[PDB]
Design a protein around this ligand. Structure first.
Ligand SMILES: Cn1c(CCN2CCOc3ccccc3C2=O)nc2ccccc21
Ligand SMILES: [Mg+2]
Ligand SMILES: [Zn+2]
Length: 313
């Protein structure tokens, strides 16, 4: 009850910033997560022993893939922590509980392969979940872990509050399917610009949480350039392995996934910044002005990729 997590001074200060990198010491990531829950939610939100058992079972159900790993989980939760801390009064008690957990769980049991690859492979999960294949899986793994003995971090909630938090988590995890991001953001753009955006409308809150989930999920592009650049290596290490596996199925992969087309990476990053990232953080900044540092950091990294194409690096 009286037991705070405390971080060294440099982390205590930098963890509050959007561009914080959680560092290479894996053993400190559980502690960093608990710290963020305690400041974001309260020391009373979860029973410490249940929360610790929950975190460690989540960690175990992430795989040793180059990018969609336990470090991604905690990184995406930190971006959500920074959004929630900069927007103190906009979110409910259940939202604060649900969203950090949603972010920690959002890529549970990821194999390093896209929905497209599972569908072309004819993976059993593509028969069980026809759209948002991996995301329905990640939600299913989240419910499985919550149901392990001593892992029910929500046990003090009422039956209807429990249903509400699991519903926040489900929609938040489904929203990380980038296929769903484009339509979600277009609707949020129209709603904001015609002035119809209403944060008391649940269907509107759902849309805004979805965009937050995309923003946190993509937050590699909002880090300082040396972090962004080195993270891109891990992202492409998965895509190129998927590309190799497409070639094994007799299917030319898209260029993004073809290791023979490394030279097209700088132009592909520009497309991604211009079509996905910048528009994502722009609409987020319009709805939640204190998230502007994410857009600024994203624009700085766009300018760094432009310099790579100009052979300035
Ligand atoms: C479109 N696109 C990309 C985008 C890469 N990408 C896309 C999705 O994964 C991410 C998730 C979070 C943050 C960044 C990324 C990222 O770097 N690289 C490419 C190379 C050739 C052709 C098209 C390409
Ligand atoms: Mg995912
Ligand atoms: Zn993710």
């Amino acid at each position: 009850g009286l037991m705070q997590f405390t971080l060294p001074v440099r982390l205590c200060k930098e963890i509050e910033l959007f561009h914080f990198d959680i560092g290479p010491f894996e053993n400190m990531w559980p502690g960093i997560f608990v710290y963020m829950v305690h400041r974001s939610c309260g020391t009373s939100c979860f029973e410490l022993e249940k929360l610790c058992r929950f975190i460690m079972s989540v960690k175990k159900n992430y795989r040793r893939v180059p990018y969609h790993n336990w470090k991604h989980a905690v990184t995406v939760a930190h971006c959500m922590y920074a959004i929630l801390q900069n927007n103190h009064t906009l979110f409910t008690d259940l939202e604060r509980k649900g969203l950090l957990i949603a972010c920690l769980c959002h890529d549970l049991d990821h194999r390093g392969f896209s929905n497209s690859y599972l569908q072309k492979f004819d993976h059993p999960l593509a028969a069980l979940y026809s759209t948002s294949t991996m995301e329905q899986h990640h939600f299913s793994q989240t419910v499985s872990i919550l149901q392990l003995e001593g892992h029910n971090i929500f046990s003090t909630l009422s039956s209807s509050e429990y249903e509400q938090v699991l519903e926040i988590i489900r929609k938040a995890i489904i929203a990380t399917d980038l296929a769903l991001y484009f339509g979600n953001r277009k609707q949020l753009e129209e709603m904001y610009q015609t002035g119809s955006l209403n944060l008391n409308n649940q269907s509107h809150r759902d849309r805004v949480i979805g965009l937050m989930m995309t923003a946190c999920d993509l937050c590699s592009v909002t880090k300082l350039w040396p972090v962004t650049k080195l993270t891109a290596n891990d992202i492409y290490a998965e895509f190129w392995a998927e590309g190799d596996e497409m070639k094994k199925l007799g299917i030319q992969p898209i260029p993004m996934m073809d290791r023979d087309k490394k030279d097209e990476v700088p132009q592909g990053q520009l497309g991604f910044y211009n079509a996905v990232a910048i528009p994502c953080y722009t609409t987020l900044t319009q709805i939640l002005p204190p998230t502007e540092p994410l857009l600024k950091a994203c624009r700085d990294n766009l300018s760094q990729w432009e310099k790579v194409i100009r052979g300035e690096e």
